Amino acid sequence: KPHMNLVVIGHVDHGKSTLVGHLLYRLGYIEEKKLKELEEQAKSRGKESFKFAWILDKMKEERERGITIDLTFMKFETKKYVFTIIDAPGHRDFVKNMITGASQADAAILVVSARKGEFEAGMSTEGQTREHLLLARTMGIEQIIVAVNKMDAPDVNYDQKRYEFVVSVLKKFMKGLGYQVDKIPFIPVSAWKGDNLIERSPNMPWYNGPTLVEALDQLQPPAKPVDKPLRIPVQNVYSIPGAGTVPVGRVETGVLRVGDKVVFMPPGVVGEVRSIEMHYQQLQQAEPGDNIGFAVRGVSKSDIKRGDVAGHLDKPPTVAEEFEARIFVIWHPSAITVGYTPVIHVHTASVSSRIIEIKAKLDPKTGQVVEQNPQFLKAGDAAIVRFKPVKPLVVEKFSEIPQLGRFAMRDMNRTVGIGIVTDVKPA
Amino acid sequence: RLTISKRELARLLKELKKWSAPATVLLSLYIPPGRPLSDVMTLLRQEYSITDNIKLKRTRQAVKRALSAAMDRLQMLTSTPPNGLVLFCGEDMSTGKFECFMFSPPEPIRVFYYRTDKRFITDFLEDMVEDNNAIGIIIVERDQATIGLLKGARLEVLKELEGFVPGERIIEQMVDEFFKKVGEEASNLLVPLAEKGVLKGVIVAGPGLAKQEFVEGNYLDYRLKKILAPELVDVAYQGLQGLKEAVMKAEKVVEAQMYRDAVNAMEEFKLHLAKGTGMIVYGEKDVEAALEMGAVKTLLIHESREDLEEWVEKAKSSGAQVIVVPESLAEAEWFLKTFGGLAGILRFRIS
Numbered sequence: 001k002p003h004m005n006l007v008v009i010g011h012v013d014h015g016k017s018t019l020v021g022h023l024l025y026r027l028g029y030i031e032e033k034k035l036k037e038l039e040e041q042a043k044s045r046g047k048e049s050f051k052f053a054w055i056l057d058k059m060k061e062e063r064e065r066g067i068t069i070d071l072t073f074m075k076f077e078t079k080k081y082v083f084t085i086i087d088a089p090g091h092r093d094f095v096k097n098m099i100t101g102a103s104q105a106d107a108a109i110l111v112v113s114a115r116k117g118e119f120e121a122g123m124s125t126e127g128q129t130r131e132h133l134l135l136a137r138t139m140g141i142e143q144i145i146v147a148v149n150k151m152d153a154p155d156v157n158y159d160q161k162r163y164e165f166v167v168s169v170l171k172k173f174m175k176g177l178g179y180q181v182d183k184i185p186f187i188p189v190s191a192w193k194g195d196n197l198i199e200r201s202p203n204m205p206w207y208n209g210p211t212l213v214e215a216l217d218q219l220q221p222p223a224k225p226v227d228k229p230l231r232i233p234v235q236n237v238y239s240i241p242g243a244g245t246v247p248v249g250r251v252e253t254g255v256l257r258v259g260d261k262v263v264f265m266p267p268g269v270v271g272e273v274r275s276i277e278m279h280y281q282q283l284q285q286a287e288p289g290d291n292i293g294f295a296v297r298g299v300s301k302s303d304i305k306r307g308d309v310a311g312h313l314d315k316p317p318t319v320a321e322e323f324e325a326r327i328f329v330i331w332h333p334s335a336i337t338v339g340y341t342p343v344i345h346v347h348t349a350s351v352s353s354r355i356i357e358i359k360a361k362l363d364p365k366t367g368q369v370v371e372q373n374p375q376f377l378k379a380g381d382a383a384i385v386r387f388k389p390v391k392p393l394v395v396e397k398f399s400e401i402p403q404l405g406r407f408a409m410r411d412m413n414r415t416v417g418i419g420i421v422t423d424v425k426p427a
Numbered sequence: 428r429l430t431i432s433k434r435e436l437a438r439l440l441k442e443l444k445k446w447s448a449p450a451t452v453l454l455s456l457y458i459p460p461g462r463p464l465s466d467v468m469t470l471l472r473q474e475y476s477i478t479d480n481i482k483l484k485r486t487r488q489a490v491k492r493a494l495s496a497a498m499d500r501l502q503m504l505t506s507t508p509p510n511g512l513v514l515f516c517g518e519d520m521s522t523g524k525f526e527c528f529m530f531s532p533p534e535p536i537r538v539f540y541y542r543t544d545k546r547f548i549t550d551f552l553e554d555m556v557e558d559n560n561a562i563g564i565i566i567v568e569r570d571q572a573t574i575g576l577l578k579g580a581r582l583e584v585l586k587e588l589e590g591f592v593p594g595e596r597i598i599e600q601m602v603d604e605f606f607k608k609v610g611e612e613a614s615n616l617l618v619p620l621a622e623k624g625v626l627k628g629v630i631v632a633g634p635g636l637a638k639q640e641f642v643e644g645n646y647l648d649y650r651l652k653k654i655l656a657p658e659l660v661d662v663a664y665q666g667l668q669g670l671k672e673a674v675m676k677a678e679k680v681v682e683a684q685m686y687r688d689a690v691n692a693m694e695e696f697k698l699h700l701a702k703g704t705g706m707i708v709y710g711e712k713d714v715e716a717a718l719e720m721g722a723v724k725t726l727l728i729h730e731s732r733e734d735l736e737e738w739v740e741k742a743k744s745s746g747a748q749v750i751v752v753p754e755s756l757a758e759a760e761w762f763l764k765t766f767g768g769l770a771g772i773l774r775f776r777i778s
């Protein structure tokens with residue numbers, strides 16, 4: 001049964017965690033006694049409507065504020081697939097976390113509230129339906145399902161006109177991003193009631209498409225590049241009684257087996273795999289797509305962090321002394337010059353990088369040079385630029401390992417530009 | 428010709444404080460503006476006369492030499508520059524090198540001052556360069572912190588920390604413990620500056636609640652706590668990105684207004700470029716031209732220009748706000764290579 005990684009994305013409060021939680025529940029992955037206890041705890045803290053969300057949101061600050069802060073990973077299994085599902089935050093402060101999530105994903109569920117004002121807000125200039133869609137594209141997610149959520153809400157009440165309104169807006173925007181919009185399901189659901197999650201909803205007779213589970217089965221599994229050299233960007237590092245220090249991350253390329261000797265770049269520390277675990281099931285090998293924790297003998301937690309990359313010793317992950325990229329500028333309030341230093345979000349990493357030169361401005365559609373060494377770039381421009389990371393950074397050429405070779409540029413907490421790396425000068 | 432800027436002074440001050448001599452043979456000399464240099468000259472001469480009274484030969488020679496090299500650098504000037512002159516001259520004992528530095532300070536000197544000592548006497552120049560407006564910045568998250576420092580438009584990371592708060596060898600930290608760690612580390616870096624009177628404020632920044640808990644707790648030394656900015660600033664990132672975010676957003680701290688002005692000017696400069704408004708004058712001629720007309724609303728000067736002080740002077744009279752672009756600023760080198768580090772923004776068009 002093929003495995004897939006699913007990221008759940010969308011604007012703050014639109015219903016991401018409630019969807020995932022409620023889906024896991026009616027699919028029977030969550031103990032009724034636990035759902036009962038969560039509900040009681042939720043009511044007693046003034047937050048009844050967070051009972052499904054609190055399956056995913058566990059941190060003290062998440063519960064206090066009623067928001068997701070960082071990623072949560074859950075295994076569930078449909079008729080055709082086994083999914084690792086990744087719950088991502090909508091809050092603008094934590095889009096860096098959502099991005100690491102997208103970098104690990106094969107497909108995305110975009111959760112979009114149909115509630116009056118909630119939709120418009122998410123799709124507004126500085127909204128996260130807009131931003132998350134953009135970032136998901138740049139991190140290389142092609143398969144997308146959209147859950148038009150909260151159909152149950154009184155200000156919505158299962159209205160097909162409201163639904164078709166959000167669908168059309170979403171379609172015009174998504175097509176401008178390069179999505180193949182004709183192929184993607186727009187399912188009207190209620191993450192809270194359950195409508196169209198797993199079974200079909202009587203409240204919405206006018207809807208003929210897949211339910212969300214059906215839509216999942218209609219996805220297609222991605223290429224498994226087992227013959228390219230091992231690369232595992234670390235998403236987090238735990239220190240675990242019995243195991244020791246265990247990096248977690250999704251195997252992008254190559255294969256990893258217990259016994260293997262592995263190196264973590266850019267620090268250059270080397271350890272040896274004691275064990276491998278996916279969703280609490282011990283493994284002996286892990287292949288691309290596997291989202292795993294791997295115990296490492298001889299490595300201290302302080303040696304390694306998120307955004308580090310693990311490969312085998314003979315073909316270690318490339319550390320960029322500098323690198324070259326083709327970029328498009330989504331948004332900027334003035335202009336970008338040589339010297340401009342946004343943070344680069346690539347795979348699980350995020351490191352400020354200085355533009356040391358702008359070799360050429362390109363026509364954004366054709367790719368031809370329109371000017372050698374432009375005096376600056378502005379919103380709407382495309383370019384070939386050189387980048388020097390402020391601290392050691394791992395990147396690969398897009399042509400070689402695309403999952404370590406696509407990136408976003410962010411500055412003053414906004415997404416400014418997008419990029420693919422066309423060349424790397426190794427450290 | 429001689430006048431240096433405050434940045435150029437601070438750099439020099441760092442070299443001068445290394446100079447030492449086994450006896451009182453380093454010459455320090457401060458001449459207020461408008462002193463007939465022929466009168467300073469008469470004084471150095473009377474000083475020279477007294478040198479033969481110095482019994483120790485190697486001392487007497489080191490002093491004669493320094494007075495001569497001073498009387499030489501002086502002989503070349505007709506009169507003093509607008510802010511007066513300072514001269515430091517003698518041979519450094521550990522290195523062996525002999526030099527006679529001469530320059531005019533950013534600000535005017537108010538007393539005549541002559542001294543031979545084992546070191547150069549730089550106090551007046553130290554007081555001239557410390558503006559006593561430093562702001563400490565601490566960005567706190569549950570498992571990350573960044574400590575940085577703001578003086579003027581110069582922003583810098585002093586220390587980054589990552590803790591062991593969870594989301595053979597086993598390591599593990601509670602939030603409370605990482606906060607204590609962060610606090611101590613911030614204190615060691617910042618409390619010294621607070622005592623020299625340099626540090627006027629501490630900003631606490633970061634995403635969400637962790638920054639509030641960090642303040643409420645007993646992590647930060649009381650002396651830092653006394654100069655806390657009232658408003659916590661929400662920012663998403665760590666490191667320099669985080670620091671910039673925090674400084675831009677801390678609108679109620681006056682010591683940060685300078686950095687904001689530098690960043691906002693460069694942004695208005697770039698806007699004009701991107702919108703093709705043509706309200707930007709550059710080149711010394713056109714800048715001088717526009718300046719003479721009172722046309723320039725804001726002048727941007729790269730701190731590394733030698734004639735920096737000339738233009739700073741011209742601007743204040745011309746009606747132009749000044750912005751000194753420091754080499755730390757992101758656009759600094761581009762502004763230097765592409766516009767020679769000198770450009771104004773017009774408040775009205777010339778053509």
Ligand SMILES: Nc1nc2c(ncn2[C@@H]2O[C@H](COP(=O)(O)OP(=O)(O)OP(=O)(O)O)[C@@H](O)[C@H]2O)c(=O)[nH]1
Nearest residue numbers: 012013014015016017018049067068090150191192
């Ligand atoms: N009426 C109605 N309310 C919903 C529905 N789904 C979620 N909500 C409510 O919307 C609020 C936000 O729910 P969350 O699941 O935390 O939204 P989220 O996108 O996952 O949250 P963030 O990660 O913080 O952006 C909660 O109070 C939910 O009860 C729905 O289908 N119908």
Ligand SMILES: [Mg+2]
Nearest residue numbers: 016017067068
């Ligand atoms: Mg959530």
